[PDB]
Amino acid sequence: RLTAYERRKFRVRNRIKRTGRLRLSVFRSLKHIYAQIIDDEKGVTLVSASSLALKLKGNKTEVARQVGRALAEKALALGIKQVAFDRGPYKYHGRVKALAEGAREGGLEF
Amino acid sequence: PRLKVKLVKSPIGYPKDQKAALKALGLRRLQQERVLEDTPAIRGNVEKVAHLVRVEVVE
Amino acid sequence: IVISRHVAIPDGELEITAIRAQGAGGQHVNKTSTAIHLRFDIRASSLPEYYKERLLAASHHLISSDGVI
Amino acid sequence: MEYRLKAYYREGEKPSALRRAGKLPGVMYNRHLNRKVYVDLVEFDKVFRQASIHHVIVLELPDGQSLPTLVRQVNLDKRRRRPEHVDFFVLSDEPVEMYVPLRFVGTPAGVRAGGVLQEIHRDILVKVSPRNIPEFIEVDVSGLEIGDSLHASDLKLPPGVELAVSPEETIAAVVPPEDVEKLAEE
Amino acid sequence: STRNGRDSQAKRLGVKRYEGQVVRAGNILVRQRGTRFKPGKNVGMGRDFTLFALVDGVVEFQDRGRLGRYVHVRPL
Amino acid sequence: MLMPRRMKYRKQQRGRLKGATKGGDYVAFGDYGLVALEPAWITAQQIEAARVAMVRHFRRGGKIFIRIFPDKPYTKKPLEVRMGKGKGNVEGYVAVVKPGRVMFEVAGVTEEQAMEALRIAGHKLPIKTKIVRRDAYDEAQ
RNA sequence: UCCCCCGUGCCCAUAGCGGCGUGGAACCACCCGUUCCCAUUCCGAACACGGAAGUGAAACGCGCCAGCGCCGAUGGUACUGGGCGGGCGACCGCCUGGGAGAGUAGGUCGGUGCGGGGGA
RNA sequence: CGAUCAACGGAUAAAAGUUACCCCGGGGAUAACAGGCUGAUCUCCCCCGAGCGUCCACAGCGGCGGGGAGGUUUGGCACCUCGAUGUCGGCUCGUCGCAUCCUGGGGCUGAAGAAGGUCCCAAGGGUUGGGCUGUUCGCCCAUUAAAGCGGCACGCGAGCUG
RNA sequence: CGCCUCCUAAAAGGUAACGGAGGCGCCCAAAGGUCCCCUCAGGCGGGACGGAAAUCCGCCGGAGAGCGCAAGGGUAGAAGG
RNA sequence: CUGACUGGGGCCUGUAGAGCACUGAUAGGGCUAGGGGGCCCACCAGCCUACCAAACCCUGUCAAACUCCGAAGGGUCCCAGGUGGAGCCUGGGAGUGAGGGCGCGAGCGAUAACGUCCGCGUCCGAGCGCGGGAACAACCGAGACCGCCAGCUAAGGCCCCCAAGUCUGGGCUAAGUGGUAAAGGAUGUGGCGCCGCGAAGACAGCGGUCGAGUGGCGCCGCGCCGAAAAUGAUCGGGGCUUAAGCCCAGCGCCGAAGCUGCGGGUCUGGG
Ligand SMILES: [Mg+2]
Ligand SMILES: [Mg+2]
Ligand SMILES: [Mg+2]
Ligand SMILES: [Mg+2]
Ligand SMILES: [Mg+2]
Ligand SMILES: [Mg+2]
Ligand SMILES: [Mg+2]
Ligand SMILES: [Mg+2]
Ligand SMILES: [Mg+2]
Ligand SMILES: [Mg+2]
Ligand SMILES: [Mg+2]
Ligand SMILES: [Mg+2]
Ligand SMILES: [Mg+2]
Ligand SMILES: [Mg+2]
Ligand SMILES: [Mg+2]
Ligand SMILES: [Mg+2]
Ligand SMILES: [Mg+2]
Ligand SMILES: [Mg+2]
Ligand SMILES: [Mg+2]
Ligand SMILES: [Mg+2]
Ligand SMILES: [Mg+2]
Ligand SMILES: [Mg+2]
Ligand SMILES: [Mg+2]
Ligand SMILES: [Mg+2]
Ligand SMILES: [Mg+2]
Ligand SMILES: [Mg+2]
Ligand SMILES: [Mg+2]
Ligand SMILES: [Mg+2]
Ligand SMILES: [Mg+2]
Ligand SMILES: [Mg+2]
Ligand SMILES: [Mg+2]
Ligand SMILES: [Mg+2]
Ligand SMILES: [Mg+2]
Ligand SMILES: [Mg+2]
Ligand SMILES: [Mg+2]
Ligand SMILES: [Mg+2]
Ligand SMILES: [Mg+2]
Ligand SMILES: [Mg+2]
Ligand SMILES: [Mg+2]
Ligand SMILES: [Mg+2]
Ligand SMILES: [Mg+2]
Ligand SMILES: [Mg+2]
Ligand SMILES: [Mg+2]
Ligand SMILES: [Mg+2]
Ligand SMILES: [Mg+2]
Ligand SMILES: [Mg+2]
Ligand SMILES: [Mg+2]
Ligand SMILES: [Mg+2]
Ligand SMILES: [Mg+2]
Ligand SMILES: [Mg+2]
Ligand SMILES: [Mg+2]
Ligand SMILES: [Mg+2]
Ligand SMILES: [Mg+2]
Ligand SMILES: [Mg+2]
Ligand SMILES: [Mg+2]
Ligand SMILES: [Mg+2]
Ligand SMILES: [Mg+2]
Ligand SMILES: [Mg+2]
Ligand SMILES: [Mg+2]
Ligand SMILES: [Mg+2]
Ligand SMILES: [Mg+2]
Ligand SMILES: [Mg+2]
Ligand SMILES: [Mg+2]
Ligand SMILES: [Mg+2]
Ligand SMILES: [Mg+2]
Ligand SMILES: [Mg+2]
Ligand SMILES: [Mg+2]
Ligand SMILES: [Mg+2]
Ligand SMILES: [Mg+2]
Ligand SMILES: [Mg+2]
Ligand SMILES: [Mg+2]
Ligand SMILES: [Mg+2]
Ligand SMILES: [Mg+2]
Ligand SMILES: [Mg+2]
Ligand SMILES: [Mg+2]
Ligand SMILES: [Mg+2]
Ligand SMILES: [Mg+2]
Ligand SMILES: [Mg+2]
Ligand SMILES: [Mg+2]
Ligand SMILES: [Mg+2]
Ligand SMILES: [Mg+2]
Ligand SMILES: [Mg+2]
Ligand SMILES: [Mg+2]
Ligand SMILES: [Mg+2]
Ligand SMILES: [Mg+2]
Ligand SMILES: [Mg+2]
Ligand SMILES: [Mg+2]
Ligand SMILES: [Mg+2]
Ligand SMILES: [Mg+2]
Ligand SMILES: [Mg+2]
Ligand SMILES: [Mg+2]
Ligand SMILES: [Mg+2]
Ligand SMILES: [Mg+2]
Ligand SMILES: [Mg+2]
Ligand SMILES: [Mg+2]
Ligand SMILES: [Mg+2]
Ligand SMILES: [Mg+2]
Ligand SMILES: [Mg+2]
Ligand SMILES: [Mg+2]
Ligand SMILES: [Mg+2]
Ligand SMILES: [Mg+2]
Ligand SMILES: [Mg+2]
Ligand SMILES: [Mg+2]
Ligand SMILES: [Mg+2]
Ligand SMILES: [Mg+2]
Ligand SMILES: [Mg+2]
Ligand SMILES: [Mg+2]
Ligand SMILES: [Mg+2]
Ligand SMILES: [Mg+2]
Ligand SMILES: [Mg+2]
Ligand SMILES: [Mg+2]
Ligand SMILES: [Mg+2]
Ligand SMILES: [Mg+2]
Ligand SMILES: [Mg+2]
Ligand SMILES: [Mg+2]
Ligand SMILES: [Mg+2]
Ligand SMILES: [Mg+2]
Ligand SMILES: [Mg+2]
Ligand SMILES: [Mg+2]
Ligand SMILES: [Mg+2]
Ligand SMILES: [Mg+2]
Ligand SMILES: [Mg+2]
Ligand SMILES: [Mg+2]
Ligand SMILES: [Mg+2]
Ligand SMILES: [Mg+2]
Ligand SMILES: [Mg+2]
Ligand SMILES: [Mg+2]
Ligand SMILES: [Mg+2]
Ligand SMILES: [Mg+2]
Ligand SMILES: [Mg+2]
Ligand SMILES: [Mg+2]
Ligand SMILES: [Mg+2]
Ligand SMILES: [Mg+2]
Ligand SMILES: [Mg+2]
Ligand SMILES: [Mg+2]
Ligand SMILES: [Mg+2]
Ligand SMILES: [Mg+2]
Ligand SMILES: [Mg+2]
Ligand SMILES: [Mg+2]
Ligand SMILES: [Mg+2]
Ligand SMILES: [Mg+2]
Ligand SMILES: [Mg+2]
Ligand SMILES: [Mg+2]
Ligand SMILES: [Mg+2]
Ligand SMILES: [Mg+2]
Ligand SMILES: [Mg+2]
Ligand SMILES: [Mg+2]
Ligand SMILES: [Mg+2]
Ligand SMILES: [Mg+2]
Ligand SMILES: [Mg+2]
Ligand SMILES: [Mg+2]
Ligand SMILES: [Mg+2]
Ligand SMILES: [Mg+2]
Ligand SMILES: [Mg+2]
Ligand SMILES: [Mg+2]
Ligand SMILES: [Mg+2]
Ligand SMILES: [Mg+2]
Ligand SMILES: [Mg+2]
Ligand SMILES: [Mg+2]
Ligand SMILES: [Mg+2]
Ligand SMILES: [Mg+2]
Ligand SMILES: [Mg+2]
Ligand SMILES: [Mg+2]
Ligand SMILES: [Mg+2]
Ligand SMILES: [Mg+2]
Ligand SMILES: [Mg+2]
Ligand SMILES: [Mg+2]
Ligand SMILES: [Mg+2]
Ligand SMILES: [Mg+2]
Ligand SMILES: [Mg+2]
Ligand SMILES: [Mg+2]
Ligand SMILES: [Mg+2]
Ligand SMILES: [Mg+2]
Ligand SMILES: [Mg+2]
Ligand SMILES: [Mg+2]
Ligand SMILES: [Mg+2]
Ligand SMILES: [Mg+2]
Ligand SMILES: [Mg+2]
């Protein structure tokens, strides 16, 4: 049996991988918020960023725009370009959205 | 090696594909003997018609 | 076989001759028909013997003198 | 008795051939072993009819090796109704699941009423060690009557010899007879 | 005395390019009713479930088990 | 007097009888049995004629098991009609029996009584039959 | 390179179900709130935001057990491409090449890629 | 946009019957007769032995079922014959089969005798005259040793009838 | 008498009979596009009228529900609400 | 050079078989709703059932329009072999669009038809040309350019009709079986198996005497009955009996318009 959570998960991630951009996937825990650019043809994570990792800060949301802007900076340097925003099972919102807007400023294309 | 394949029994009344085999082998008359490279392809056709042929090994 | 309303009648002591067709319809009536049935039920065989006796003394066509039906 | 049967390893031999010669072909195996064998037909048979899958057969192989075994399955030929091929299971020390016969002791009062005893298992599945192979397991069918039944939950048992089957399984029953007055109705 | 006797024009369904076959963008690779094959990489599905090559390349069939079977076109 | 009480389909095509029986080859209920030597359709009115005869041989008996049952519909066009204009009407049902199947068994009765009851029952069947005892092989299946 | 945990994929039940059993430093959950963003055909249950008393109860992770489930040989058979014989039939055989399904032995309480936080 | 053009690739915008008063071109590509193949149907014969026969399965019978033979019935097929193979029934003339109606020989009998029943062997010979109907068939009269059943293109119309 | 589904059909496709079975000659302004959320039948226990079945609560439950309509194929990682 | 046909390799597939997990069918037993009946009892429930019986379970099965499973084969693409009255392309001219038998797979029919309808294949058609099958379009053998008073074979044959063995070794059969049939019945006869009762002397005869074997089953071979049809009989005929029959195993021969030898003709390709 699957949970509404496990489905919504699949339901979005499916549609996403269908368009075949790089996957920017976002986990958001109660304490922290994490992000990875993934190429799921090669099965490999390319560029990574988080709150727990960059050790900050923080207001839960404002932490995000940072870990967002964080990822782009790094990312862009390794050559991306563009990418598809995986919203996981999470209403596109902030912290989740507040990332994103974070990545978008840093130059990530989407 | 080589295969020496002699056609000893008539294909009349046998299926067209076995007739075709006999052609890919190159045997057109009764009693005719042909000396044939032994590859897998040749052997396949030699086996397909095996009930019309007498085979023996050579060269 | 032969499916009379209460008892029996058994399982083949009855005689059905196929004879030729009287009247209309050509060589086929002259020839392949036939297709007509005479029958013989000879009154003493099987039967309750109450049918046999109420059957034997009755005055009817279809029921012969020696009859035989 | 402890039943002994000769037996011989075969390799390329076509079973058609063996079979033709009077040799019923078979395999033997367990967790550590698998080997292609045959026995003699008429000889194998001598045993099996008294033996079956109930009692231990001991195969005496030409290498002198002699292994204790239970018959697992006989593959019959449906047309002839003759054994085609035999599975020999080599017992070792462990316990093993297997089939233990039933003596149904005593005459049911379901019979003697005019009824009939339907033995719905002539034997019973059981986990048990090969030291423990009971020559059989008895059951009192005397208190059984027309309509009545016996479930293996109420089966007696030795030590041990744990059942392997739902004790809800049904080992015996006493059914009413075939009858002619039944005819006219039906 | 028959209520029967009908039947319908037959539909020529099934895979139209097998694995290893070279296609061209646009090729129909499967004709099907519902989804007997899911479109994999570079293969699209049309409103009737027909699958077709999105690019020129080589067919590959994939069996993902529980997930179903897929048809991919490996580009060249 | 044996037929399905319901069918998915009313009439069905004839098919062949190749081979020996899918199974049904070993005894499995009673003590003694009747096995089929030849393939055939067995008509319910035969299967029942066969049953009945044994029950009568027992007069008040053991058990009679019936291991084949007539689920195939038997069709016939009425008499004198020509070819076509549909498929005929179901006039009976048969059981399909390929060789080696055990059709009847008996239990609860003496060896001499099964040897008879199964023999007489045999004659009502339209094929060759063997009488059998329980073996060890029937017990090991 | 090794152990742990968090994310993602791949295999596609040997990965499931059901019993026990363990973990809270970390991570994760549950948890404290409902001002604010955002929400309920009613409900802060869910979604969502601001937190950090507490607890691993629930869930999740890691372990053990074979009751079910799942997998499953070897051998033999059925069936058969091709070649041949038998019968009035239904049908029955042989040769050569392929060869199941069920059943038995057994197996299984997952394995693995990339990336991160920690630990040795 | 206007089609039950639904006989749905849709002859006209517009259309039903009868012919024993009938005609032509064709077909044994196709029916009615006969034959043939088949043998479901029919006729005969066997298997089994429930069960009748006071008693007793089997003198005589034979539930439910099973196997066959014949090619006389009705059919199924559509194979020669549609540049013709005249159709029922009668008469005349026969000849053959035997699954025998009589006559000859036998076994069993629920065969005292006399008569019967049933089966077996037997085709040499025989197998009547009338009333009714076109009839074959059948019913009926009077007899009889008996008043047999089939085959021959349901024998026989370059032999007759009609 | 056209169209669709299944079988016959001999594991590509196609395949006949006055062979076995059924449907169509409509429909939907939402039954359409997209974004977002949600998950069934069924079973056992619980509960005013309340029953076999109205609505409510729990536990079990891969899909046997649903998908306007016949059948088939597909399908909850949705095509269903 | 691509063709049929074949080798290897990949994908596609749901038949034969098998299975029962789905849809249905389904015998018996278990467990157990609900009916029915007997007991009470109208105080409203309780017991027994050898009755009918849902769900579920166990044993045992069935299915074109069932499938948890599933071959052999088939289809297609690639690479290779394949030079063939192969192949592709553009044109000119057709005829055919009544098929038929046999095999195998099915439907219809009656597990009938020289029956119908499809599928794969073959032959006849057009090979009624040749050898075998007594005779006989399609069964067996074989694809006939012409000539030979030469040779080797095929199927089938080798007692005489009638070319070649009254050939060799083993066995069966006594019916002329061979030389048209079924259920069924039987001290026909022969070969392998299984037990019983036998000097504890049934085993048949009229617990005694006889002195040796007997009695009931299995798997197989060949025969017997079952077996009636209409002009005259018959295996093609004569005739055949340790075969001129049947089974097994050899050797030699005969036998076509097949193949060879020799001569010739024409087409085609090449020197
Ligand atoms: Mg030939
Ligand atoms: Mg051939
Ligand atoms: Mg081919
Ligand atoms: Mg070749
Ligand atoms: Mg009768
Ligand atoms: Mg008149
Ligand atoms: Mg008139
Ligand atoms: Mg008229
Ligand atoms: Mg034996
Ligand atoms: Mg009962
Ligand atoms: Mg209709
Ligand atoms: Mg049709
Ligand atoms: Mg179709
Ligand atoms: Mg069609
Ligand atoms: Mg294409
Ligand atoms: Mg689309
Ligand atoms: Mg692959
Ligand atoms: Mg029948
Ligand atoms: Mg019937
Ligand atoms: Mg019989
Ligand atoms: Mg058992
Ligand atoms: Mg079984
Ligand atoms: Mg991967
Ligand atoms: Mg699975
Ligand atoms: Mg995992
Ligand atoms: Mg704990
Ligand atoms: Mg903590
Ligand atoms: Mg703590
Ligand atoms: Mg939550
Ligand atoms: Mg816990
Ligand atoms: Mg989690
Ligand atoms: Mg287990
Ligand atoms: Mg298995
Ligand atoms: Mg094998
Ligand atoms: Mg084969
Ligand atoms: Mg075969
Ligand atoms: Mg083939
Ligand atoms: Mg074959
Ligand atoms: Mg024959
Ligand atoms: Mg075979
Ligand atoms: Mg083989
Ligand atoms: Mg092999
Ligand atoms: Mg195998
Ligand atoms: Mg297997
Ligand atoms: Mg196991
Ligand atoms: Mg383990
Ligand atoms: Mg497990
Ligand atoms: Mg993982
Ligand atoms: Mg580290
Ligand atoms: Mg119009
Ligand atoms: Mg109209
Ligand atoms: Mg209509
Ligand atoms: Mg028209
Ligand atoms: Mg019109
Ligand atoms: Mg038309
Ligand atoms: Mg059209
Ligand atoms: Mg017009
Ligand atoms: Mg007019
Ligand atoms: Mg006229
Ligand atoms: Mg007039
Ligand atoms: Mg008129
Ligand atoms: Mg006039
Ligand atoms: Mg006129
Ligand atoms: Mg005219
Ligand atoms: Mg016509
Ligand atoms: Mg005539
Ligand atoms: Mg006629
Ligand atoms: Mg004629
Ligand atoms: Mg006949
Ligand atoms: Mg007879
Ligand atoms: Mg008497
Ligand atoms: Mg009496
Ligand atoms: Mg009768
Ligand atoms: Mg019959
Ligand atoms: Mg009959
Ligand atoms: Mg007949
Ligand atoms: Mg005739
Ligand atoms: Mg006729
Ligand atoms: Mg004609
Ligand atoms: Mg015709
Ligand atoms: Mg004419
Ligand atoms: Mg003329
Ligand atoms: Mg004339
Ligand atoms: Mg004239
Ligand atoms: Mg007169
Ligand atoms: Mg006579
Ligand atoms: Mg008579
Ligand atoms: Mg006399
Ligand atoms: Mg005298
Ligand atoms: Mg007498
Ligand atoms: Mg008396
Ligand atoms: Mg007298
Ligand atoms: Mg006479
Ligand atoms: Mg005479
Ligand atoms: Mg006379
Ligand atoms: Mg007279
Ligand atoms: Mg007169
Ligand atoms: Mg007068
Ligand atoms: Mg008059
Ligand atoms: Mg009259
Ligand atoms: Mg007369
Ligand atoms: Mg006469
Ligand atoms: Mg006539
Ligand atoms: Mg006449
Ligand atoms: Mg006459
Ligand atoms: Mg006349
Ligand atoms: Mg004349
Ligand atoms: Mg006049
Ligand atoms: Mg197909
Ligand atoms: Mg096919
Ligand atoms: Mg819709
Ligand atoms: Mg519910
Ligand atoms: Mg409730
Ligand atoms: Mg309450
Ligand atoms: Mg209430
Ligand atoms: Mg309620
Ligand atoms: Mg609920
Ligand atoms: Mg559904
Ligand atoms: Mg289907
Ligand atoms: Mg929706
Ligand atoms: Mg080439
Ligand atoms: Mg090619
Ligand atoms: Mg190939
Ligand atoms: Mg499948
Ligand atoms: Mg099958
Ligand atoms: Mg089932
Ligand atoms: Mg089972
Ligand atoms: Mg169902
Ligand atoms: Mg039941
Ligand atoms: Mg099917
Ligand atoms: Mg089929
Ligand atoms: Mg099927
Ligand atoms: Mg499998
Ligand atoms: Mg395959
Ligand atoms: Mg292609
Ligand atoms: Mg291939
Ligand atoms: Mg090439
Ligand atoms: Mg042109
Ligand atoms: Mg042209
Ligand atoms: Mg011209
Ligand atoms: Mg033309
Ligand atoms: Mg045709
Ligand atoms: Mg043709
Ligand atoms: Mg043909
Ligand atoms: Mg054959
Ligand atoms: Mg038939
Ligand atoms: Mg035919
Ligand atoms: Mg024909
Ligand atoms: Mg012509
Ligand atoms: Mg010829
Ligand atoms: Mg030709
Ligand atoms: Mg001629
Ligand atoms: Mg000839
Ligand atoms: Mg000839
Ligand atoms: Mg002919
Ligand atoms: Mg030529
Ligand atoms: Mg010579
Ligand atoms: Mg020869
Ligand atoms: Mg000879
Ligand atoms: Mg000579
Ligand atoms: Mg001699
Ligand atoms: Mg000799
Ligand atoms: Mg005689
Ligand atoms: Mg003779
Ligand atoms: Mg004779
Ligand atoms: Mg016989
Ligand atoms: Mg017999
Ligand atoms: Mg003897
Ligand atoms: Mg004998
Ligand atoms: Mg012996
Ligand atoms: Mg003695
Ligand atoms: Mg005879
Ligand atoms: Mg006679
Ligand atoms: Mg010889
Ligand atoms: Mg020549
Ligand atoms: Mg020359
Ligand atoms: Mg030329
Ligand atoms: Mg030149």
UniProtKB/Swiss-Prot annotation, chain A:
Biological process, per Gene Ontology: translation
Highest rank taxon of the organism: Bacteria
CDD domains named among the record's database cross-references: Ribosomal_L18_L5e (cd00432)
One Gene Ontology cellular component annotation held by this UniProt entry: cytosolic large ribosomal subunit
Cystine residue pairs: none
Coiled-coil portions: none
Pfam family, one: Ribosomal_L18p
Keywords linked to the UniProt accession: Ribonucleoprotein, Ribosomal protein, RNA-binding, rRNA-binding
A Gene Ontology molecular function term of the record: 5S rRNA binding
Subunit organization: Part of the 50S ribosomal subunit; part of the 5S rRNA/uL5/uL18/bL25 subcomplex. Contacts the 5S and probably the 23S rRNA; has been isolated in a complex with the 5S rRNA and uL25.
Family: Belongs to the universal ribosomal protein uL18 family.
Annotated function: This is one of the proteins that bind and probably mediate the attachment of the 5S RNA into the large ribosomal subunit, where it forms part of the central protuberance.
Name of the protein described by the UniProt record: Large ribosomal subunit protein uL18
Lineage: Bacteria, Thermotogati, Deinococcota, Deinococci, Thermales
Curated annotation (Swiss-Prot), chain B:
PROSITE patterns cross-referenced by the UniProt entry: RIBOSOMAL_L30
Cross-referenced SUPFAM superfamilies: Ribosomal protein L30p/L7e
Annotated organism of origin: Thermus thermophilus (strain ATCC 27634 / DSM 579 / HB8)
Gene Ontology MF: a single term: structural constituent of ribosome
UniProt KW keywords: Ribonucleoprotein, Ribosomal protein
GN (gene name): rpmD
Entry keyword annotation includes Transferase: no
Protein name per UniProt: Large ribosomal subunit protein uL30
UniProt-listed Gene3D superfamilies: Ribosomal protein L30, ferredoxin-like fold domain
GO cellular component terms attached to this protein's record: cytosolic large ribosomal subunit
Complex formation: Part of the 50S ribosomal subunit.
Curated annotation (Swiss-Prot), chain C:
Localization annotation: Cytoplasm
Function: Rescues stalled ribosomes. Can hydrolyze peptidyl-tRNA on ribosomes stalled by both non-stop mRNAs and mRNAs that contain rare codon clusters or ribosomes stalled in the middle of mRNA. First identified as a complementary ribosome rescue system when the stalled ribosome cannot be rescued by the SsrA(tmRNA)-SmpB quality control system or the alternative ribosome-rescue factor A (arfA).
Domain commentary: The unstructured C-terminal region is required for ribosome binding and peptidyl-tRNA hydrolase activity. The C-terminal tail functions as a sensor to discriminate between stalled and actively translating ribosomes by binding in the mRNA entry channel downstream of the A site between the head and shoulder of the 30S subunit. This allows the N-terminal globular domain to sample different conformations, so that its conserved GGQ motif is optimally positioned in the peptidyltransferase center (PTC) to catalyze the hydrolysis of peptidyl-tRNA.
Oligomeric and partner information: Associated with 70S ribosomes and polysomes.
Membership in a protein family: Belongs to the prokaryotic/mitochondrial release factor family.
Protein name: Peptidyl-tRNA hydrolase ArfB
Species whose genome carries this gene: Escherichia coli (strain K12)
Record gene name: arfB
Residues of the full protein shown: 2 to 70 of 140
Swiss-Prot record, chain D:
Similarity field: Belongs to the bacterial ribosomal protein bL25 family. CTC subfamily.
Full protein name: Large ribosomal subunit protein bL25
Biological process (GO), any one: translation
GO terms of molecular function: 5S rRNA binding; structural constituent of ribosome
Record-linked PANTHER family: RIBOSOMAL PROTEIN L25/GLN-TRNA SYNTHETASE, ANTI-CODON-BINDING DOMAIN-CONTAINING PROTEIN, RIBOSOMAL PROTEIN L25_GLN-TRNA SYNTHETASE, ANTI-CODON-BINDING DOMAIN-CONTAINING PROTEIN
Superkingdom of this protein's organism: Bacteria
Function comment: This is one of 3 proteins that mediate the attachment of the 5S rRNA onto the large ribosomal subunit.
Transmembrane segments: none
